[PDB]
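Weekly modeling sync, notes
Attendees: AB, CL, MP (scribe)

Item 1: holo prediction request
CL wants a bound-state model with 2-acetamido-2-deoxy-beta-D-glucopyranose before deciding which constructs to order. AB pointed out that an apo prediction alone won't tell us much about the pocket. Agreed to run with the ligand included and paste results into these notes for async review.

Input as submitted:
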Amino acid sequence: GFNFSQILPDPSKPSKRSFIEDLLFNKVTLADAGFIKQYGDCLGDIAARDLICAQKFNGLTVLPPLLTDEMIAQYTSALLAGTITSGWTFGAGAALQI
Amino acid sequence: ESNKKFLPFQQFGRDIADTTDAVRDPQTLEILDITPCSFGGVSVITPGTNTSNQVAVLYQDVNCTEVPVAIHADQLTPTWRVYSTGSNVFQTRAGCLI
Ligand SMILES: *[C@@H]1O[C@H](CO)[C@@H](O[C@@H]2O[C@H](CO)[C@@H](O)[C@H](O)[C@H]2NC(C)=O)[C@H](O)[C@H]1NC(C)=O
Ligand SMILES: *[C@@H]1O[C@H](CO)[C@@H](O)[C@H](O)[C@H]1NC(C)=O
Ligand SMILES: *[C@@H]1O[C@H](CO)[C@@H](O)[C@H](O)[C@H]1NC(C)=O
């Protein structure tokens, strides 16, 4: 009778994100972006008067993370699908169902 | 070329780091835009000199439709002329890998 539909992933999206996770993604707005491959941009264009081009033109870069946002979602889905079908036992050995 | 409307008493245009990024040509009264030519970081991938002396080279945040004229390819030794253009070229989000 318990309904875990809003926190488990849905296959319709192109990612493994649940309904709460993309609600959480669309509330952390960025004061500056990261990498949009803005290096073809900022050269020769007139809309180069944002923040990131003036930073990048003085030696200041941003390196990408090692785990993407689609691997962290797989990790938190594998952590959540073991608690439901095993309980407290999968973090001490083998997953015993109950 | 630009869309900037210079007033008739102005010659140059500055930005948030106090560098000229717009100029007026002193013969035809038109407004050009200035942008530095491309740069970035260079990191070397090695398996350790014990195992081999064969390396790979990553060019950060660029494309490799723009690498071999940036690095001094024909100006330098043949040994930097295998890691500038070859058959092993892969495009990743951390720059493209050669
Ligand atoms: C768990 O809760 C969700 C959300 O309330 C239920 O999803 C709804 O399913 C009905 C089907 O009868 C749809 O008409 C609604 O549009 C769905 N809501 C949403 C937000 O998608 C789901 O059915 C519940 N699980 C069970 C087993 O009842
Ligand atoms: C000389 O300067 C004038 C300024 O308007 C320009 O129109 C003209 O083309 C110039 N002549 C040259 C560069 O021979
Ligand atoms: C640079 O590479 C990216 C990824 O392949 C591509 O989307 C972009 O169009 C490229 N820039 C060019 C071809 O000027």
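Recorded for review: Strands of chain B lie at 12-14, 20-24, 31-33, 42-45, 56-59, 90-92, 95-97.
Action items: CL to compare against the apo run; MP to circulate these notes.
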